[PDB]
Amino acid sequence: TSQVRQNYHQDSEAAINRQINLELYASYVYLSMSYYFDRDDVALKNFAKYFLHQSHEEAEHAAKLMKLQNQRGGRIFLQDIKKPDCDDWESGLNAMECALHLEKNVNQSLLELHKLATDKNDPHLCDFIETHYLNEQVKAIKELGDHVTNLRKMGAPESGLAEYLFDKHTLG
Template structure:
């Protein structure tokens, strides 16, 4: 015998499109977590041995997991239902070089940012001021700062070159 559960009592002015976009964002944040963990694992290998890059990407992974958790909590608070989807694995396990990994990270962060902007536009379209404020307070500013930081890291990596330069930059990331 199955018991039919009543709908959420806390749900108010939460458009189904926005609920779906929050679920999509949860999945995207978990995917970003996987990608960054993959990068951290690559740079931790004994044949790569760049512990600063490993540390940086591990911290980024934890940040993405925290973001997913924040969206899960938000979905519940708004009376929405969290729908877990299959998380795509990273497109690769071998990241070639620190420059290549950072360029991939920048592209990933741009995708995450665009998804957040699309969700914000939907929130405004459906007069969901709470969702718009939530995104502005917790995610949009942080995302712009992350894009800027990764872009600066790419510039530094190109400037220092391979060999001793990348070794010194890796040391900087260890701090």
């Protein structure tokens, strides 16, 4: 119906809406993590800062998807942003592992979206995904994997000194 809509399948529109909700959910998870590390009984300031930055970045990814939805003449349908799985993330290492799992889940969703766009012969949508989301996800996954490896090698979560020093030296 939109005067600008061209080569934009309804399935693609629906998938974009689902991706918007997933990105908002990921941002909310990161927010929860960030303020977990701000707790007085956790007190890892750079973990909190790292996850807060991640949250803001995820928010921006969601917003970019909404912008695309409008650009292509699709209609944004928002849904509830579900609360994260955990209130207490239990350690820096556990939070990093959960973030890695989350980023891989988002990446899988993006790959499914790219598959759909390819099936619908929507080169603009494919190129948008590749340009703005896929390599960002690969880099994020690599960085989180590096963090997890380093934390495990340093002796986290059992060694509190490990998480303290990782907070200072890697995230600081």
